[PDB]
C-alpha cells in the first residue's frame, strides 16, 4: 500500500529519517499480475537483506561495522543536517556493495558469539 | 563402517625392501588419515606415521626418517560418501630387528584435535 | 618412556583401574591421552580417546581421567572378554601416538 | 500448509490465543498459478505490518500505545473469558486503521530511541 | 541472488556452519515467470517457519527444545568434526518433522511468557 513514502525527498537527511512530522488472461490479465509478482520480488530483495544483517523488523538498525573514512571523510554536521537522502546515495552509490559483504559477515559472526555465550 | 584389507604375509632378509598394501572399502578415502604402526616382538607398539590421502601430506616418526616411503593413490568413487583406496608403505635399510606385524589404520575424525586417531585397524601383515 | 602399570586384575563384578604416566616430555597436562584394548598380534580397537572421550559403540563401563600428571583407564564391572593388555597414547593436534609399555589384566 | 488454524473460531478470546490445548497453460494451469500468488500478496500483507510494528517472528507482540477506551470500555474479564475474536473484531473493526497508524508510530520512535540510546 | 552457499558441501558440519573462511507471453515468457514465482514460494516456505520458531533474521538461533537421544546418540565431537550437513540430515531426515511442531510450540509458549513478564 503506503510504500510512497517519498514525502521528505527535497529534505536533509536527518530531517528526513530522524524525527519525522480474477483476471481474464488478457492485456490487462497478464499485464495486472506481473506487476503484481515484481512487486514483491523487490519486497524480498530488501527484506532478505535485512535478514542477513540482524535488520529484521527494524527501519534504523546499529551495526558493528566502523565507517571506513575513505567512503566518505564528511561530519556528521554536514550530512544530516547539509545533504538529502537521493544526493548522498549517489556520492557513497560507488561502495554501496563493499559495505552490504562487510555487514553480512559482521552479523554471522554475531551469530555465533552468542552461540558461544548461550553454551554456558 | 570401512574396511581396510592389508597385503600378504610374505618375508625377506635383511638389506631388502618391502611393499605392504592396504585397500580400503565402505569409506571415503580421502577424508582420513592412513596410520600405520609397527609392533616389533622385541620392544613396545610403535608409531611409524600418518599420510593424508587429500592434501598428500606426510609425518614420520624420526626412527622411520629417513628409512620409509609411504604412498597413496588416488581414490576409485563408489558412491557419494563411498570410495575405494589404496596406501602404500616401505622401509629402507631393513634389517631383521624390523620384524613383526604391520597394521594401516585410518583416521579417527577429520577435525578437531584427535584428527588422526588410528581408529578403524586393517588386518595387520606378518612379517619376519 | 610412558610407563603404566606393571600388571592388574581383578574379578566379575568388580573394577579395575590402569596407571599411565611419564616425564613432563610426554606426560601430561599439555597433552591428550588416548586408551587401546589390544590382543597381542591382531587387530586393536579404539577405547578411549583426548583424556574421557569415548569411541563409538563403546559401552559406558569404560572411563578415562587425567590429573596433571598421569592417566587412569577405570573398567567398572569386567567381563570375560576384557582380559587382554592394554596401551595407552600420548599426542596432541599435530604429532604422532607415544604409546606405553604396556599392562595386562585378568579375571 | 497449516495456515488453518481457525480449530478454535467458537471459543472465548483466553481460551484460544492464550494457552492453546510445472503447469500446462490451460485453465487449470493458469488457475493454479493465480491461486499461488494470490496466496502469499496477503502473506506479505500482514508480515510487512507485523515488521511495521516490530513484532516480526512473533506471535504476541506488547506494544507501548494505551488502550483508549473509546475504542472498547469493557473489562479484561468480560473479553478474554466471554467474548471470541470472530465477534471482538466486529466490534472493534471500525477504529482498527487508528490502531494501525498509532502502532506504526510508535515503532518508528522506539526506533530512534535505541538509536539514541547506542549512540553512548 | 547468492542463494548457492553451496560451497562447503563436503566439509565437515563445524568447519561450514560454525565458523567460515518485460515479458512476450511466449515459452520464454511464461517460462521466465514461473520460475520466478516457484523461488519465492520456497524462500517463505522457509521464512515462515523461521518465524514461527523465534528465528527471524538469525542463522544460529538457540531453541529451548532439548535433545532427545532417540533421534542421534551420537556426541558433538563426532558429529561437527567427522560428518557433513549433507549426510547429517539423511541420518537425521526421519524425525525432522516432529522436531519442526515441538519447536512450534516451545516458541508461542516462549510468547506468552514474556506476555506475563511484561504484564507486571
Ligand atoms: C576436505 O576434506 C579434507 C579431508 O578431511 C580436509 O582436510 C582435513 O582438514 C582438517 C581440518 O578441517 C585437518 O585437521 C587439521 O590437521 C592439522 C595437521 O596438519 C598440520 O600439520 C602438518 C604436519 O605438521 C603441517 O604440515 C600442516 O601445515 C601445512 O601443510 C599442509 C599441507 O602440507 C596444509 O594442508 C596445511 O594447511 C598447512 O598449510 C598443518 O599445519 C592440525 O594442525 C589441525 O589442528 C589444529 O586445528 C584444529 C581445527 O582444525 C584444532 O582443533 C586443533 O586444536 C589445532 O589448532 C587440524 O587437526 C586434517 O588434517 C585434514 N586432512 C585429513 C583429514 O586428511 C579438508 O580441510 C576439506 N576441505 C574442505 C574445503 O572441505
Known amino acids: 500500500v503506503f510504500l510512497g513514502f517519498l514525502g521528505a525527498a527535497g529534505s536533509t537527511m536527518g530531517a528526513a529519517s530522524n524525527t519525522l512530522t480474477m483476471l481474464q488472461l488478457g492485456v490487462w490479465g497478464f499485464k495486472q499480475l506481473q506487476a503484481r509478482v515484481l512487486a514483491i520480488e523487490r519486497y524480498l530483495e530488501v527484506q532478505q537483506l535485512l535478514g542477513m544483517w540482524g535488520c529484521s523488523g527494524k527501519l534504523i538498525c546499529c551495526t558493528n561495522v566502523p565507517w571506513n573514512s575513505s567512503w566518505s571523510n564528511k561530519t556528521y554536521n554536514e550530512i544530516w543536517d547539509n545533504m538529502t537522502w537521493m544526493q548522498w546515495d549517489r556520492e557513497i552509490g560507488n561502495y554501496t556493495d563493499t559495505i552490504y559483504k562487510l555487514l553480512e559477515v559482521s552479523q554471522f559472526q554475531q551469530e555465533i558469539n552468542e552461540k558461544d555465550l548461550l553454551a554456558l | 563402517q570401512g574396511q581396510l584389507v592389508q597385503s600378504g604375509a610374505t618375508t625377506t632378509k635383511p638389506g631388502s625392501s618391502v611393499k605392504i598394501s592396504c585397500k580400503t572399502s565402505?569409506?571415503?578415502?580421502?577424508?582420513?588419515?592412513i596410520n600405520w604402526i609397527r609392533q616389533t616382538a622385541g620392544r613396545g607398539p610403535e608409531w611409524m606415521g600418518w599420510?593424508?590421502?587429500?592434501?598428500?601430506?606426510?609425518?614420520?616418526?624420526?626412527?622411520?626418517?629417513?628409512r620409509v616411503n609411504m604412498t597413496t593413490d588416488t581414490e576409485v568413487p563408489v558412491t557419494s560418501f563411498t570410495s575405494t583406496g589404496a596406501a602404500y608403505m616401505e622401509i629402507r635399510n631393513l634389517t631383521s630387528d624390523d620384524t613383526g606385524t604391520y597394521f594401516c589404520?585410518?583416521?579417527?575424525?577429520?577435525?578437531?584435535?584427535?584428527?588422526?586417531?588410528?581408529?578403524?585397524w586393517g588386518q595387520g601383515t606378518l612379517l619376519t | 618412556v610412558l610407563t603404566q602399570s606393571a600388571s592388574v586384575s581383578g574379578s566379575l563384578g568388580q573394577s579395575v583401574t590402569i596407571s599411565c604416566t611419564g616425564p613432563n616430555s610426554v606426560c601430561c597436562s599439555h597433552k591428550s591421552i588416548s586408551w587401546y584394548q589390544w590382543p597381542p598380534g591382531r587387530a586393536p580397537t579404539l577405547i578411549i580417546y583426548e583424556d574421557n572421550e569415548r569411541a563409538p559403540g563403546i559401552s559406558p563401563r569404560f572411563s578415562g581421567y587425567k590429573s596433571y600428571w598421569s592417566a587412569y583407564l577405570t573398567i567398572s564391572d569386567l567381563r570375560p572378554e576384557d582380559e587382554t593388555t592394554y596401551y595407552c597414547c600420548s599426542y596432541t593436534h599435530n604429532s604422532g601416538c607415544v604409546f606405553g609399555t604396556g599392562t595386562k589384566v585378568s579375571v | 500448509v497449516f495456515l488453518g488454524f481457525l480449530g478454535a473460531a467458537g471459543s472465548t478470546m483466553g481460551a484460544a490465543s492464550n494457552t492453546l490445548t510445472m503447469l500446462q497453460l490451460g485453465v487449470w494451469g493458469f488457475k493454479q498459478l493465480q491461486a499461488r500468488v494470490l496466496a502469499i500478496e496477503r502473506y506479505l500483507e500482514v508480515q510487512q505490518l507485523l515488521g511495521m510494528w516490530g513484532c516480526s517472528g512473533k506471535l504476541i507482540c506488547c506494544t507501548n500505545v494505551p488502550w483508549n477506551s473509546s475504542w472498547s470500555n469493557k473489562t479484561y474479564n468480560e473479553i478474554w473469558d466471554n467474548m471470541t475474536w470472530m465477534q471482538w473484531d466486529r466490534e472493534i473493526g471500525n477504529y482498527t486503521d487508528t490502531i494501525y497508524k498509532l502502532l506504526e508510530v510508535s515503532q518508528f520512535q522506539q526506533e530512534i530511541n535505541e538509536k539514541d540510546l547506542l549512540a553512548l | 541472488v547468492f542463494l548457492g552457499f553451496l560451497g562447503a558441501a563436503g566439509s565437515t558440519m563445524g568447519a561450514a556452519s560454525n565458523t567460515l573462511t518485460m515479458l512476450q507471453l511466449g515459452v520464454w515468457g511464461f517460462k521466465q515467470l514461473q520460475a520466478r514465482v516457484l523461488a519465492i514460494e520456497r524462500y517463505l516456505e522457509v521464512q515462515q517457519l523461521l518465524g514461527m520458531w523465534g528465528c527471524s533474521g538469525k542463522l544460529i538461533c538457540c531453541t529451548n527444545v532439548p535433545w532427545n537421544s532417540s533421534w542421534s546418540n551420537k556426541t558433538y565431537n563426532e558429529i561437527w568434526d567427522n560428518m557433513t550437513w549433507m549426510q547429517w540430515d539423511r541420518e537425521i531426515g526421519n524425525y525432522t518433522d516432529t522436531i519442526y511442531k515441538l519447536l512450534e510450540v516451545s516458541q508461542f509458549q516462549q510468547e506468552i511468557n514474556e506476555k506475563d513478564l511484561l504484564a507486571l
Open positions: 599420510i593424508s590421502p587429500y592434501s598428500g601430506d606426510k609425518n614420520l616418526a624420526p626412527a622411520f626418517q629417513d
Open positions: 565402505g569409506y571415503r578415502f580421502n577424508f582420513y588419515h
Open positions: 589404520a585410518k583416521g579417527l575424525l577429520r577435525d578437531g584435535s584427535s584428527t588422526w586417531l588410528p581408529y578403524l
